[PDB]
């Protein structure tokens, strides 16, 4: 029903409607296939307590 409904909505919505429906879907697939983010680190950082002479 979903597919047919889309088709009919698309038909009323015209060709422009299908066009970007296609890009939406393509975006989704491409994205799902490739999900990712990345940070690389060199371990560093310290808690420093220093004393000062007077």
């Amino acid at each position: 029903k979903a597919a047919e409904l889309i088709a009919n909505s698309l038909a009323t919505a015209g060709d422009g409607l299908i066009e970007l429906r296609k890009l939406e879907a393509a975006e989704d697939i491409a994205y799902q296939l490739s999900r990712s983010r990345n940070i690389t680190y060199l371990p560093a950082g310290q808690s420093v307590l220093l004393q000062l002479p007077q």
């Binding site: 491409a30 994205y31 490739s34 999900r35 990712s36 983010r37 990345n38 690389t40």
Partner: protein, 49 residues
Amino acid sequence: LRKIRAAQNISKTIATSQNRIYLTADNLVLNLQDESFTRGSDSLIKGKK
């Protein structure tokens, strides 16, 4: 440039990937034994008056 922008995003999304290992630790265990254990003794004939 819309094309380039889209290309940037596509390449960026696709490109990223990595994996790393970490090892949090610290070894702190206390084994405490006090008065309890055994040494050894030899054999000697003894006698007290």
